[PDB]
């Protein structure tokens, strides 16, 4: 059986959906700046082994059509969550409860699905971005310029419009292979005129596990679309904050298996590590099992490490 593509109207969305395998339902999540592609290793690895893989493109990405790009409000996480709940009522209408994996922006959708309809999630498998404690004195966007300063790649993505120009002259093909390919611990620069200058480049054979054929995937779809959707879900991070307020002290009830790479810029972000490793993070999601820390790998571990990664979630989901 091969992988099947479907179109579903959700939350006002004609969403793109490719499927592999029958069983459980396994909701997974893509982040930025990536696709339903993403979880190819993973869903051919859990449909072999008795699951139903589900991977849809998320709003303003890919196949998935109906969102405003001129409009980075309708990009909140409460809208992000909304396509996700209505999604399971359609594509799973006999299980309660699924199981969900997701990674970067999809682990930042998936904790907030897991707060606002624990009812939906039986366990949860979550990628490279830890749980965010609301911080009550600013948002994400000034909180990481007050560390990283005017050039950080959440600073220069907020002005509609700019980010877009610079990589316009550049092409699609050439951003997302300097970003899949990136392995430092330092988050991404954007300094203005400079293209993808302030980015370091990795020795070439860390970076075997993308081929061209795959990178050609992403290109593709995203010369199309543009960067704009994608980028859109940065732009409402000022809204997200004022928006989750009622959400201030409540806690994840799902249990969790968190895994990230060594180098993963967001592992880096100050205290970050501390939040994680010493109490923090166990105290919002009191279901959190034992953090994996990916030795030599970088942010893309789906894809970088596909066997460790789809075992992770194997062995997870069997618990239960």
């Known amino acids: 059986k091969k992988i099947e593509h479907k179109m579903v109207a959700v939350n006002g969305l004609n969403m793109h959906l490719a499927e592999l395998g029958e069983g459980p339902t396994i909701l997974f999540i ?7 592609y993403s979880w190819r290793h993973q869903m051919v690895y859990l449909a072999e082994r008795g699951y139903r893989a589900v991977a849809p493109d998320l709003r303003g990405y890919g196949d ?35 199981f969900v994996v997701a990674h970067d922006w999809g682990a930042l959708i998936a904790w907030h699905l897991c707060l606002f309809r624990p009812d939906k999630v039986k366990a949860l498998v979550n990628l490279s971005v830890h749980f965010s404690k609301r911080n009550p004195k600013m ?36 951003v997302l292979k300097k970003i899949l390919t990136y392995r430092d611990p330092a988050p991404f620069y954007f300094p203005k005129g400079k293209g993808l200058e302030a980015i370091p480049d990795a020795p070439v054979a860390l970076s075997s596990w993308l081929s061209e054929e795959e990178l050609d995937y ?46 993963d810029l967001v592992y880096h972000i100050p205290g970050a590590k501390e939040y994680i490793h010493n ?26 490490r596909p066997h460790e990664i789809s075992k992770h979630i194997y062995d997870f989901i069997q618990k239960f």
């Open 279 to 304: 109490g923090g993070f166990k105290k919002d999601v009191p279901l959190l099992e034992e953090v994996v820390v990916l030795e030599g790998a970088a942010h893309f571990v789906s894809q970088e």
């Open 64 to 98: 998935t059509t109906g969102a405003p790009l001129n409009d980075p409000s309708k990009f909140s996480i409460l809208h992000l969550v909304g396509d996700v709940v209505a999604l399971l009522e359609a594509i799973a209408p006999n299980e309660e409860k699924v």
């Open 30 to 36: 893509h982040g930025f700046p990536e696709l339903w």
């Open 139 to 174: 948002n994400v966007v000034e909180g990481l310029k007050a560390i990283y300063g005017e050039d950080h790649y959440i600073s220069r993505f907020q002005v509609p419009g700019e980010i877009e120009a610079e990589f316009a002259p550049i092409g699609a093909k050439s």
């Open 218 to 263: 992403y290109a593709n779809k995203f010369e199309q679309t543009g960067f704009t959707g994608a980028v859109n879900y940065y732009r409402a991070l000022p809204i997200n904050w004022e928006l989750t307020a009622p959400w201030t002290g409540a806690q994840v009830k799902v249990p969790t298996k968190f895994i990230v790479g060594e180098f």
